């Protein structure tokens, strides 16, 4: 076969299994967070749960702009209850700082996909981060992408 730059437009996918994968590139910070850090490779980690499944802990890494390079996927069968869920409730991914002594949260955002409501697939999107205490509206932006298509097996 072949692959490359392409597009897809559809409302409801065919009758088959659906695989929801989520690959997080990395997490950028703002001039404020960069300095606020402490001139020391800041270590943080994110977490989230889909379809009320087992929560997954992101890979801890030191640095300013690490590459989690984490790719999670699970074969889930659901369409109607799927879209409704996206609305009824969204995903909450907070970013807490993991210290070598204690652990506390300093940021919290709401992960939700709008396009998924109409379209389905590689829909580029982003989310903003806000500081809980510091109250920093320019904490940083997260780079992620979602996809929902028939993960049914094929002959080939």
Curated annotation (Swiss-Prot):
Residues 8-126 form the C2 domain. The gene is RPGRIP1L. Belongs to the RPGRIP1 family. Ubiquitously expressed with relatively high level of expression in hypothalamus and islet. During early development, expressed in multiple organs including brain, eye, forelimb and kidney. It is found in: Cytoplasm; Cytoplasm, Cytoskeleton, Cilium basal body; Cytoplasm, Cytoskeleton, Cilium axoneme; Cytoplasm, Cytoskeleton, Microtubule organizing center, Centrosome. This is Protein fantom. Negatively regulates signaling through the G-protein coupled thromboxane A2 receptor (TBXA2R). May be involved in mechanisms like programmed cell death, craniofacial development, patterning of the limbs, and formation of the left-right axis. Involved in the organization of apical junctions; the function is proposed to implicate a NPHP1-4-8 module. Does not seem to be strictly required for ciliogenesis. Involved in establishment of planar cell polarity such as in cochlear sensory epithelium and is proposed to implicate stabilization of disheveled proteins. Interacts with NPHP4 and NPHP1; NPHP1, NPHP4 and RPGRIP1L are proposed to form a functional NPHP1-4-8 module localized to cell-cell contacts and the ciliary transition zone; NPHP4 mediates the interaction between NPHP1 and RPGRIP1L. Interacts with IQCB1; the interaction likely requires additional interactors. Interacts with TBXA2R (via C-terminus). Interacts with RPGR. Interacts with NEK4. Interacts with NPHP4, INVS and DVL2; the complex is proposed to be involved in DVL2 stabilization. It is linked to Ciliary dysfunction leads to a broad spectrum of disorders, collectively termed ciliopathies. Overlapping clinical features include retinal degeneration, renal cystic disease, skeletal abnormalities, fibrosis of various organ, and a complex range of anatomical and functional defects of the central and peripheral nervous system. The ciliopathy range of diseases includes Meckel-Gruber syndrome, Bardet-Biedl syndrome, Joubert syndrome, nephronophtisis, Senior-Loken syndrome, and Jeune asphyxiating thoracic dystrophy among others.
């Amino acid at each position: 076969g072949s692959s490359g730059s392409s597009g897809d437009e559809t409302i409801h996918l065919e009758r088959g299994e659906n695989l929801f994968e989520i690959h997080i590139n990395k997490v950028t910070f703002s001039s404020e967070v960069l300095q606020a850090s402490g001139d020391k490779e800041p270590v943080t980690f994110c977490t989230y749960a889909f379809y009320d499944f087992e929560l997954q802990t992101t890979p801890v890494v030191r640095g300013l702009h690490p590459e989690y390079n984490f790719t999670s996927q699970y074969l889930v069968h659901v369409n109607d209850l799927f879209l409704q869920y996206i609305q009824k409730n969204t995903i909450t991914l907070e970013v807490h700082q993991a210290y070598s002594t204690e652990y506390e949260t300093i940021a919290a955002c709401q992960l939700k996909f709008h396009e998924i409501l109409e379209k389905s697939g590689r829909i580029f999107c982003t989310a903003s981060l806000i500081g809980t205490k510091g109250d920093i509206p320019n904490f940083g932006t997260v780079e992620y992408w979602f996809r929902l298509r028939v993960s049914g097996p094929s002959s080939g």
